[PDB]
Amino acid sequence: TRQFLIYNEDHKRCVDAVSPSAVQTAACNQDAESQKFRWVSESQIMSVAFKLCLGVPSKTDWVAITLYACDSKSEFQKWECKNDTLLGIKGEDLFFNYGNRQEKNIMLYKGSGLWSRWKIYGTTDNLCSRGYEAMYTLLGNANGATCAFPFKFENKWYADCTSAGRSDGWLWCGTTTDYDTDKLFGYCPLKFEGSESLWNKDPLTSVSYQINSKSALTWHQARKSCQQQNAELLSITEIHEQTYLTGLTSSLTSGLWIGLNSLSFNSGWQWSDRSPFRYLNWLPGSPSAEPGKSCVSLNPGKNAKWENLECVQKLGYICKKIPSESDVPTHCPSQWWPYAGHCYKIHRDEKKIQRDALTTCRKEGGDLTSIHTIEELDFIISQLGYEPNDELWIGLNDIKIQMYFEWSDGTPVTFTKWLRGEPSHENNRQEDCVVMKGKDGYWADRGCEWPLGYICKMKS
Ligand SMILES: [Ca+2]
Q: Which GO terms label this protein's molecular function in UniProt?
């Protein structure tokens, strides 16, 4: 996925590493290891066959591009994409070029024509689209540090993770260049026989969880580690899910990053996997009113309740794994208005407490509105008659099960859009009902015993 051939459209040829001193071109061959390259840092491109990096002797016109021992400090090994498909040495208008003066070697060249433009073979994208993706190690002795490609083991160089030196087939990488000297490694986030033993599958739900308690990563690094495993940071949307994760972490004490955060300045608490924030299990004193603490850790030594911390804290973490043809005219009863097969109405006449608003909607054949998409929310605010300074009941509430918000109409909660700072759900304030308020129609919990207007919904 992260190895690529380097393709020139005009010549219809791919780069081919012939030797450390001969980087040329050949008819493209997706199986040829000598045609395979990979980003091993932000700016370095490594030959997979040779475990050496493309570089130049100087940043000057018409010098050969060949292969050097990879060196992250060398300016002569740094490449960048200019315009779109122009490939050049960093910091100069000098380009990776093939075709001039009967020269079979790639040359660094002042020219910026089509012979200096390159794409990832099999795509329409430039090389920097499949840029460097740091690979965070699992278990091991390096606390989740990233693979250092290429790395040396038994005096041999590795361009990718390997099972060399092992009897169990597990794939690992050095987290420094010289593993022989430094002995720092971890296992790679890749598929291999036995790799699923890094996950715990809930038999009730078939959802899988990975508890990385030995790693020390920031919230954003931890998120990248889960993402590159086709996963995301833990989200917790059911009581059972919390109970299951409490048990899986019951012998741990240090904090574990989960996916909950307040990193969107204009909205409230949210899961990084876009799950609804509808279940709350905060530690006492959280979420705290401290502006820099926008990322949430599960504290396994305190019954796996949650606390918000500074995102740069290095912790373990937990992964979890034109109208449409159907938009036909919609029948609605008088005073109700259609959207996506349902009918809606705002009650402003007589403000009511939440439970009386609910009774009224139901006597009229509907219910307090549920809201399942941003488009449904946008219909309400932009067309239905909502004004920015409104505050109106919707159907979300945790009256039946404290800390577990549900829709009064019984439909699943699959979407939340909370105001900044919401849900606040402050101790002893009984904020068990929910309103839409403010110019964006975002939501807030609040006490249920206050007269307000409200929004009803029904099926057409
Ligand atoms: Ca509130």
A: cargo receptor activity; D-mannose binding; signaling receptor activity; transmembrane signaling receptor activity; virus receptor activity
